[PDB]
Amino acid sequence: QDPRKFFPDNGFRFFDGPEDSFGDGNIPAQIILTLTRQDEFILKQEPVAAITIRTNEGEMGVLAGHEYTVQQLAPGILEVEYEGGKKDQYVISGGFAHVNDTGVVDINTVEAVPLEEIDHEKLAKALEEARAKSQSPDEAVRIQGEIALEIFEPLEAALH
């Protein structure tokens, strides 16, 4: 028998993660954002002035040199603000935001769609369905309607 003909590579090594820094003494002027849905990015290390995330504890706002914090993303909207003053809103389905002191943001999600790709007419129909599903006494339907309403209520609040 051949002595270990195979020697597979570790796939983690094919990615390039940031290296965290202690005591660097320099504050970044603008963050380096990286948003990813299921596998594909929509933004790769873009310069960004500011960003605004939603969580279960509440809505947070991140700027350059924000403290290292890792935390959930509650299912809602996500605002990016470039140096030019414009903005870009994205609806998400959960995730984890990884902030850096050096100025790097990895918002890894399961979905990321702009609000422009959503219509209020189609949303209004789903609302009463999720609501009446929450009314039906049954654990299989109540939780599903609760989750659907949880994602829809911020949309109904933001489109207005």
């Binding site: 202690f22 005591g23 003494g25 320099n26 504050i27 040199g65 403290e67 290292y68 002191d101």
Partner: protein, 52 residues
């Protein structure tokens, strides 16, 4: 006093890079608290050692 220094640690725990820029405000808050205590004590030391 401690409420100042107690803050500086926690801040430094969350951002070591800023530890060198927060110390002036820390020393300033400490100095003002200490000075208030110093006047409170200066009354008493002035209350006794001169008045008959």
């Amino acid at each position: 006093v401690a409420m100042c220094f107690s803050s500086y640690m926690l801040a430094a725990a969350r951002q070591p890079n800023m530890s060198a820029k927060l110390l002036p405000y820390c020393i300033l808050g400490f100095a003002l608290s200490e000075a208030l205590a110093l006047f409170t004590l200066l009354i008493a030391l002035l209350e006794l050692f001169v008045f008959s």
